[PDB]
Paper text:
The crystal structure of TsaC was determined to a resolution of 2.18 Å using the structure of meso-2,3-butanediol dehydrogenase (BDH) as a model for molecular replacement. In the solved structure, there are two copies of TsaC in the asymmetric unit, each of which showcases a Rossmann fold and contains a central seven-stranded β-sheet and seven α-helices. Based on an approximate interface of 2837 Å2 (16.2% of the total monomeric surface area), these two subunits form a dimer, and like that observed in BDH, this dimer and two symmetry-related molecules assemble into a tetramer. However, decorating this binding site, and following β2, is residue Asp36. This inactive conformation is a hallmark of other SDR enzymes that, like TsaC, do not have a nicotinamide coenzyme bound in the active site. In agreement with the observed inactive state of the catalytic tetrad, approximately 30 residues between β6 and α7 are too disordered to build and are therefore missing from both monomers in the refined structure of TsaC. The equivalent of the hinge residues in TsaC are Pro185 and Pro221, which bookend the unresolved loop.
TsaC, an annotated short-chain dehydrogenase/reductase (SDR) enzyme, and TsaD, an annotated aldehyde dehydrogenase, are the next enzymes in the pathway.
Author numbering:
A (entry chain A), C (entry chain A): 2 to 187, 221 to 248
B (entry chain B), D (entry chain B): 2 to 144, 151 to 186, 221 to 248
């Protein structure tokens, strides 16, 4: 149960982010839905609101400090605090050979799947440390069990993000702040995993990556 | 015997990359010494030529396409081909709390190391695939879990992914994980025909 | 909450097994405490009973099919069913160099940390499959993070047990039966991990090994 | 060049172990062919001696101390020493539901493979430690997650643990993971001085 708790969910307009926002709001948390797409973010918030929830939509490029700080400040100021930060990876776009991935796609993966976690760390972790509680859950991009070709550059930055998440966790391990990760492997099970990890029943877990059925 | 083979060594002017440049030259291989410091690259090249080897030094920001393509085009045009690419792109890093890490400090570890493997793949592996043979060796020099420990995991992961994407192509892609002689030995082994049964493998060795 | 649920906990008289038995009984489960030591098993059951619980002690060599079948039958007949099976690894005994480990210690590790999981599979899994629900949690022996010398033969059979647990899980994955594992790495966090994995809130997890602070 | 070196190859009468026995003999190394079938071991030994090599065949249940100690004592007494031990002890296994696996079927995978590495360590590594040099190579032949997939993980894990427990001893402990030429090549490499910078390493190669 996450009553009186505030969550930011990035990637919130679609995919795993929308399912995660739905689940956390169903558990009683106030949700700031953050997404590149302001309209998609607002639609998800309207849906959560129509269903009994308290939610707000906000546009945000998780690669930009200012966008990520503004979403943290918006959650604190207008929803009244921040206790949970869920960073959603993208939809992995299409599967194609390593040498067909253009620079723009490579760059986007870096921005959305690694740089976002760095800014999340810089923008949300001090608040958590200050209040002596908080949870960050990083949802990796979806890679197959024993993955084959087609996701080489995704699997690369994914391995980096999971290790950064475990590294951040060791630093914050005696702060009350828990930093954990979800590895969707080919939406209910992804959302259930995030909702459990955000709950106080997961208080004994940090620096963990939970493999779940994508 | 890397005689009759051309090798590009990134980060070649010092550290693991200098030691690799020397071992590979000593094995009889032409070597394009690539590094961020043109002066140091030229220095290593002159030493190698002075030791009886063949070598050209070029300034190269591995995070930039033009720089990597230059190093590749030069090796094919001036050194006479390309059969080996060694990617050394890590640096030392004082472990400080992650909230003291500036964006640049972060990009230098995650953005440079990853994109260097990216440009290495876009720029050099088509030449390997065209001739049906070639070896990429990615030394994870980035320097227990720290904020920067993810570069090494990605380098290893990318090595294994690229290797699968080049299965049965005659193109082998391998890694070295230094935890410098033993590093240069593992590179020279992996770059040699004696390692033709090995692709997608990471060799942990004492640094 | 594990009300109206029956758990077998092996290794139950001491160590992580006792902490796990305490936690599961505190959550409402009936506990058959199984242990090599009949008296230690009975003492733990008496403690759980004095605290509000329903518990029974029973001697059992988890390396022997007959001992393991008798504990399953005892739980079904006298506590009224079986839904949870926790296999506790040993205390890792002492840390000593690989070549100082005698054959008797090597043999004991195999029996307690691997053969037990095979019999648990043969003796408890058909019952779970029959009823279409059930959870098995295998608690590995405690190994350090990035472990050094001293636990070579433990770390060997531990790696085997965790892979067997993931293998068993894939087989039973569409049966309602969840097979999961806990890796104590140097007792509350071990017991919390087992209690969560045994609950219906972990229903979306199978074939997972949870690293936790030992 | 394994000339001037003695090697014990377990499971030597067929499969990966025969191919290893031949490659190592061809490298100039005396070879004690150890296997569960004495006749087949003697056959391989005769073939190797007939090819100009030196070899003795012995029946050996690797799960038993006396059998492994015999193979070790014989190699030191009849073949003139011991510098290499290759552990092949896996077998093929039809994947069936785990509830159809009999206790014996389970012991044959988990008990034999693990205890074989145990006796290999108790029986052979003291000789290596005494002379300050030696190489143990553990080929994980036990044959995606299955009930028997844990043998391979243990073999790799034990290899890395033993290697750490023998750091700086001149005694190297390595593994090969066949997913037979490429297996025998990786064994012969790992057993040779060319691999002296490698301990605690598992080489994945196509089987």
């Amino acid at each position: 149960n996450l009553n009186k708790q505030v969550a930011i969910v990035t990637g919130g307009a679609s995919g795993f982010g929308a399912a995660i926002a739905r689940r956390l709001s169903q558990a009683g948390a106030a949700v700031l839905v953050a997404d590149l797409n302001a309209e998609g973010a607002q639609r998800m918030a309207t849906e959560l609101n129509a269903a009994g929830g308290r939610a707000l939509g906000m546009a945000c490029d998780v690669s930009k400090e200012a966008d990520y700080r503004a979403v943290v400040d918006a959650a604190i100021a207008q929803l009244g605090g921040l206790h949970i930060v869920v960073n959603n990876a993208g939809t992995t776009h299409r599967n194609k050979p390593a040498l067909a991935v253009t620079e723009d796609e490579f760059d986007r993966v870096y921005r959305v799947n690694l740089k976002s976690v760095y800014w999340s760390a810089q923008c949300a972790l001090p608040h958590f440390a200050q209040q002596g509680h908080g949870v960050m859950v990083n949802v990796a991009s979806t890679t197959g069990v024993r993955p084959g070709p087609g996701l080489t550059w995704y699997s690369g930055s994914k391995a980096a993000m999971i290790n950064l998440t475990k590294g951040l966790a060791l630093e914050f391990a005696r702060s009350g702040v828990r930093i954990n990760a979800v590895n969707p492997m080919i939406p209910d099970d992804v959302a259930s995993a995030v909702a459990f990890l955000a709950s106080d029943d997961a208080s004994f877990l940090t620096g963990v990556c939970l493999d779940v059925d994508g």
